[PDB]
Amino acid sequence: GQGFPSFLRNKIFIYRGKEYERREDFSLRLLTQFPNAEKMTSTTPPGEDIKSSPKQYMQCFTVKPVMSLPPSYKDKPVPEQILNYYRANEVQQFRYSRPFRKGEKDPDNEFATMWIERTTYTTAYTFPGILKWFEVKQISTEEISPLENAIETMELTNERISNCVQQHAWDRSLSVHPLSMLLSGIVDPAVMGGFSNYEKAFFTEKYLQEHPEDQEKVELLKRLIALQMPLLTEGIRIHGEKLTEQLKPLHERLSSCFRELKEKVEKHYGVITL
Amino acid sequence: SRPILELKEKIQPEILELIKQQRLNRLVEGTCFRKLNARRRQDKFWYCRLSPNHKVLHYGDLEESPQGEVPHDSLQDKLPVADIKAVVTGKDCPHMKEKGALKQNKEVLELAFSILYDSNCQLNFIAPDKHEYCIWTDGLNALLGKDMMSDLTRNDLDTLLSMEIKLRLLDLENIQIPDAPPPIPKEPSNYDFVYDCN
Amino acid sequence: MQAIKCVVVGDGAVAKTCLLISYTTNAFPGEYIPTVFDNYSANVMVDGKPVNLGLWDTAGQEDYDRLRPLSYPQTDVFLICFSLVSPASFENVRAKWYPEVRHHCPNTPIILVGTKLDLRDDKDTIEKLKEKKLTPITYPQGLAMAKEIGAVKYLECSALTQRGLKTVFDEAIRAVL
């Protein structure tokens, strides 16, 4: 808008929010800071009219704190505290996921068109700083294939498994309910069979004629699920260590489907394990 | 007093906007309003602050505060000023229509006001007494930007207009205003003022 | 810090998981990223102290009533869901979901939740329901069912708007608290 102050007119800022404000909580508090509190709905793109119009407009949303580089830490098996501290602070890069339907939108396969125009941000100063907010110093976007987005989603899922295994590995007096959370959600891609979706969508030769040159990515999926499988194994083992009477039925379903997918990757996917 | 009244009621609006401005001041300073059937340990009193921006309503189940309004985040600091359909008064309040556990007795017939929003959510609230009930109805109707439904509001209107016109009549002492306004002496068609302008 | 079990069922024709994932992501309306795995969780405070919370995303297919009850035990709160615009959803919940839940879990604070609040007042949706002779069922009757169980609360919301959705979860968490 135009009615903004000089430093505010058609500007973009990122706010080091509180620990646990939900998006619209902080949003409303900001609205308290301001009159003419009309909120936009095309959250990603701007408005050229409002790039000149008066009657101040705003749009706010959460963004991703890009991981810092832990200096001299790039390989050490450092405990969690170091990680979690650098997951929050001394940050300057901030990406925002961008859903998009790119191509043909078949009903059963939402992964057919997921193309993420990942919008990142660079600001002047590193959070936290002498202001709980700063303007973006430079914006950038991306483009992410269903192959790619698949890749990152699954690998981050796997490392989340690893993290929960480790946090309940150092500590014993710790609720197994998160273990149920994960092991359940992963054990059945029930709503959509993710693994089967990847097989039909990319492992199929319709895709390796769709992406012959970009077949070197379905092999990425293969090696990544291959690295996933043993991680699933430690998940299963720790579950057995924390197995309870409600859990034995759950555990056996996990185990059965788990070696099922073990053979599925080894021979049905044909991948090689470790 | 014929042209006197013509002039007096004809110069209405300044007092009108003055009273409305005072009403907005009142809603902003606000107080702890009243809930429904807050008997078995319920905070019957709870502040309801209009923003100085006059757009958000800092209201919600605040404690049995004798001090009244406390400036902080109420339970729901927002009531959308724009979308309020109206406020129902008396029997039109569905909570007045309630005949169960939240049956409001006939002694709060004039204290019943339900502010309409979302078309399925209501604000079944109670005033401490009638005069401020009418005051807050006036305030929301000033948010509605319409006529005022407080007896006290017409009282203040008429009385302050009376004093204002009464102090107006000071320069015109020992004079009569012809009910037909005095004939405008003819302006010569030339505006070539012999003596200079300003 | 502490964790809370939270089971959630409801038919698969209403996409409650979209509600869950949009809430957890804190995403923009209509901008959630549908994952491939279920049983979501988060960690927010409603009051005083941060707490972990786990949403048992459960498929509503009736066959899985041999597996879902194994998830039931020691659940702090359950959330029963439907579509405000699907009379079949009402018939299922009043007839199957609610009774079986009350049977399997006769002792747990329960909150009913509506869905597609906008579509309840959507002129096109309601006119379709009339031309199909389905009922754009409104709040008071859901309230009546909530009284029938005496559920500690009932709320209704819309995914594309998240209206009261955050609140919905707020009473959901305070139900344990």
Rg (CA), chain B: 24
Cβ distance of C139 and B120 shorter than 8 Å? yes
Separation in Å, CA A54 to CA A50, A60, B76: 7, 19, 30
Q: Note whether B112 and B38 are same-domain residues.
A: yes
Task: Tell me the β-bridge partners of A93.
Answer: A122
Dihedral (CA of C64, C67, C69, C71) sign: negative
Test the A interface: residue of B50, B51, B55 with most A CBs within 10 Å: B55
Q: Method used for this model? A: cryo-EM
- Encoded amino acid at B78, one letter: K
Instruction: Tell me the chain B residues in contact with residue C138 when contact means C-beta distances shorter than 8 Å.
Output: 120
- Of residues B53, B77, B78, nearest to A35 (C-beta): B53
Helices A247-263 and A177-187: crossing angle, nearest 10°? 40
Residue A119 phi/psi, 5° resolution? -95, 120
Identify the chains in contact with A, defined as 3+ C-beta pairs within 8 A.
Answer: B, C
- Nearest CA-CA distance, residue B22 and chain C, Å: 34
Test the B interface: residue of A27, A32, A38 with most B CBs within 10 Å: A32
Strand arrangement, sheet containing C77-81 = C41-44, C51-57, C5-9, C77-81, C110-113, C153-155
A64-65 and A91-96 strand pairing: antiparallel
Q: What is the DSSP code string of A64-94? A: EE-----TT-SSS---HHHHHHHTTSSEEEE
Resolution of the coordinates in A?
4.3
Return all residues near A201 (Cβ < 8 A) that are at least 6 apart: A109, A111, A112, A146, A207
Question: Where do the DSSP E strands lie in chain A?
Answer: 13-15, 64-65, 91-96, 119-127, 133-140
Contact predicate B5/B12, CB 8 Å: no
Instruction: Tell me the chain C residues in contact with residue B120 when contact means C-beta distances shorter than 8 Å.
Output: 138-139
Identify the chains in contact with B, defined as 3+ C-beta pairs within 8 A.
Answer: A, C
Asked if C138 is an interface residue toward chain B (Cβ–Cβ < 8 A), one would say yes
Return all residues near C160 (Cβ < 8 A) that are at least 6 apart: C29, C30, C118
136-195 of B, contacting A, C-beta below 8 A: none
B112-115 and B87-89 strand pairing: antiparallel
Q: Note whether B129 and B85 are same-domain residues.
A: yes
Cβ distance of A181 and C40 shorter than 8 Å? yes
Q: Note whether B197 and B140 are same-domain residues.
A: no
Contact predicate C54/C4, CB 8 Å: yes
Helices B130-143 and B13-29: crossing angle, nearest 10°? 110
Q: Note whether B104 and B117 are same-domain residues.
A: yes
Dihedral (CA of C173, C82, A178, C75) sign: positive
Dihedral (CA of C148, C152, C153, C159) sign: negative
Q: For the beta carbon of residue A169, count every other beta carbon within 10 angstroms.
A: 14
Instruction: Tell me the chain A residues in contact with residue C75 when contact means C-beta distances shorter than 8 Å.
Output: none
Q: Note whether B24 and B86 are same-domain residues.
A: no
Q: Note whether B84 and B41 are same-domain residues.
A: yes
Measured CA to CA, the distance from residue C113 to residue C167 in angstroms comes to: 12
- Nearest CA-CA distance, residue C67 and chain B, Å: 38
Separation in Å, CA B9 to CA B6, B60, B171, B178, C43: 6, 41, 19, 17, 64
Q: Note whether B53 and B133 are same-domain residues.
A: yes
Q: Helix, strand, coil % (nearest 5) of chain A?
A: 45, 10, 45
**CA A2 and chain centroid, separation:** 35
Instruction: Tell me the chain B residues in contact with residue C121 when contact means C-beta distances shorter than 8 Å.
Output: 119
Q: Note whether B141 and B44 are same-domain residues.
A: yes
Asked if A186 is an interface residue toward chain C (Cβ–Cβ < 8 A), one would say yes
- Encoded amino acid at B31, one letter: T
Cβ distance of A157 and C166 shorter than 8 Å? no
Instruction: Tell me the chain A residues in contact with residue B79 when contact means C-beta distances shorter than 8 Å.
Output: none
- Encoded amino acid at B161, one letter: L
Q: Note whether B59 and B114 are same-domain residues.
A: yes
Q: Note whether B141 and B155 are same-domain residues.
A: no
Short-list C120, C54, C59, C50, CA closest to C90: C120
Measured CA to CA, the distance from residue B12 to residue A252 in angstroms comes to: 84
As given in the structure block, the two tokens for residue B172 are 């015109």
Query: How many structural domains is chain B composed of?
Result: 2
H/E segment holding residue C79: strand C77-81
Asked if B91 is an interface residue toward chain A (Cβ–Cβ < 8 A), one would say no
A119-127 and A91-96 strand pairing: antiparallel
DSSP state of B196: P
Range of the domain at B59: 30-146
Cβ distance of A35 and B55 shorter than 8 Å? yes
Instruction: Tell me the chain C residues in contact with residue A188 when contact means C-beta distances shorter than 8 Å.
Output: 38
Instruction: Tell me the chain C residues in contact with residue B119 when contact means C-beta distances shorter than 8 Å.
Output: 121
Instruction: Tell me the chain B residues in contact with residue A37 when contact means C-beta distances shorter than 8 Å.
Output: 55
H/E segment holding residue C21: helix C16-25
Asked if B119 is an interface residue toward chain C (Cβ–Cβ < 8 A), one would say yes
- Nearest CA-CA distance, residue C124 and chain A, Å: 22
Q: Note whether B62 and B141 are same-domain residues.
A: yes
- Nearest CA-CA distance, residue A245 and chain C, Å: 10
Q: For the beta carbon of residue A243, count every other beta carbon within 10 angstroms.
A: 17
